[PDB]
Structure formats: C-alpha cells, structure tokens
Design a protein around this ligand. Structure first.
Ligand SMILES: [Zn+2]
Ligand SMILES: [Zn+2]
Ligand SMILES: [Zn+2]
Ligand SMILES: [Zn+2]
Ligand SMILES: [Zn+2]
Ligand SMILES: [Zn+2]
Ligand SMILES: [Zn+2]
Ligand SMILES: [Zn+2]
Ligand SMILES: [Zn+2]
Ligand SMILES: [Zn+2]
Ligand SMILES: [Zn+2]
Ligand SMILES: [Zn+2]
Lengths: 162, 77
C-alpha cells in the first residue's frame, strides 16, 4: 500500500523481549529528528522528550531515577550488565553521574520498568539496524536515533504515516 | 575437531568462523572482535534466543556446522 512501510517492519528475536530489524530506509524519510543537547545526558534527554509531555530542560533526571529503580530490580540479570563489569552499587554511582552516557543496557531496563517499548535506530541517515526493547510496535515505541557511534537524538514519526 | 559457524553482525551480514566446541564463548568473541573491528566489551552473543556466557565452552550450547550466532551490539552515546 502507499505510505505504509512502517506497518511492515520485520523483527527477529534476539532474546525474549529484544529484537532486531534491518529495514532499508533513510531516517528522515519517515521521522522528524528532534535534536537533543550534545552533553553526556543525551540518551536520557531523548527518552524524556518522547515520554514526558511538556517537559522541562532537565526532565531527564526523572528518567535517570527510573533507571536506578529499574537497575535495582533487573541489572544483575541483564546480559549487557556482564559487559559493564561493575557491582550494582558501583554501576549506580557511575550511571547517576552527570554526563555519563546511557546505552542499550539502560534502554533494556527502562523498557521493563516503564512498560514502554524503545527502538534504537542506528545509522548518512541510512538505517543499518533497529534494535527493539519491548514487544510494542514502532507506532507507540520511543524511537531513538544513535549516530556517529556516540550520540542519541529523539525521533517522531512524520504525520503522514500516522 | 574444527567446525565452521556463522556470526551475524548488526547490519545483518554473516561471516564464517572456524571454532572448536571446547573453546570458550569469550574466545569466539575475540575472533568476532578481530573480524568486525568492535571491542569485545561492546557486544554480546546469542544463540537460539539464549545469551552465550563468556566463560562457557561453545559445546554447552549445541552449536552445529553452520549454526548462526548473533553479535548483539552494545550502543552508548
Ligand atoms: Zn504498502
Ligand atoms: Zn512483515
Ligand atoms: Zn522482511
Ligand atoms: Zn537511502
Ligand atoms: Zn543530536
Ligand atoms: Zn543536557
Ligand atoms: Zn519537546
Ligand atoms: Zn530532558
Ligand atoms: Zn563503590
Ligand atoms: Zn582467548
Ligand atoms: Zn583460538
Ligand atoms: Zn578481550
């Protein structure tokens, strides 16, 4: 059909609740890029942008608080926790520090804690992969753009696609 | 006895690796790190929906010739 590409994304299971896709498209053909501050909190700024209506400049602190709560429940069982290599207490001290980069590990934990679905699109703006945490689809997902290997922005589906 | 398996990267490209079932997951990660040019603490592996644990031998997971393992990126920013 016309204009319904996003309705047919194919997600392959990685583990229960995490999926990957490899659609071929340019991000800006389907999404508005909502640019976030370049500081080290950009991951949490991006989540806040898409989950907290009429937010404030540093609404991301609430998301980091939710990350703490999530980590206390889930960190020891996250496969990416093993890559970080820290005890829960040392992880929390690092994670809660100003400007400490967020990641797929916090996305995984926040999807559980908040009940949301998060998709990180990694990229030109030519998509290489989407990685999805949670079982929802792209239309109610928190869509993030990961670019330059080191930066997050928020994405919003363009109106003509719904 | 040596066998070939496949490891699929983020872009969806599979590459072939010669392994032994006695070697560890960690050592397979070192081979994948060399081929893909990504540090071994920036990805983790799965097979058939199960995370692969670094210290365990590959044979604990029932890999067979040309089994596909996923290389799952850790993305930070
Ligand atoms: Zn169509
Ligand atoms: Zn489909
Ligand atoms: Zn498909
Ligand atoms: Zn294109
Ligand atoms: Zn940006
Ligand atoms: Zn900021
Ligand atoms: Zn806004
Ligand atoms: Zn914010
Ligand atoms: Zn400590
Ligand atoms: Zn080794
Ligand atoms: Zn070797
Ligand atoms: Zn190493």
């Amino acid at each position: 059909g016309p204009m319904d590409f996003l309705r047919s994304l194919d997600w392959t299971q990685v583990i229960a609740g995490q999926y990957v896709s490899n659609p071929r498209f340019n991000i800006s053909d389907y999404f508005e890029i909502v640019r976030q501050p370049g500081d080290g909190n950009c991951f949490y700024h991006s989540i806040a942008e898409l989950t907290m209506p009429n937010k404030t400049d540093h609404s991301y602190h609430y998301i980091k608080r939710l990350t703490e709560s999530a980590a206390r429940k889930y960190y020891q069982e996250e496969p990416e926790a093993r890559l970080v290599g820290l005890s829960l207490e040392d992880y929390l001290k690092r994670m809660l520090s100003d400007n400490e980069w967020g990641s797929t590990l916090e996305a995984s934990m926040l999807a559980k804690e908040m009940g949301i679905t998060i998709i990180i699109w990694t990229v030109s703006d030519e998509v290489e992969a989407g990685i999805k945490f949670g079982d929802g689809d792209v239309f109610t997902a928190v869509n993030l753009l990961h670019s330059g290997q080191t930066h997050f922005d928020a994405l919003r589906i363009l109106p003509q696609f719904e | 006895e040596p066998l070939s398996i496949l490891v699929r990267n983020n872009k969806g490209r599979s590459s072939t690796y010669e392994v032994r079932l006695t070697q560890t997951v960690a050592h397979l990660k070192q081979q994948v790190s060399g081929l893909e040019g990504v540090q071994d603490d920036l990805f983790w592996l799965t097979f058939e929906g199960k995370p692969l644990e670094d210290q365990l031998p590959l044979g604990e997971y029932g890999l067979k010739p040309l089994s596909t393992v996923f290389m799952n990126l850790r993305l930070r920013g």
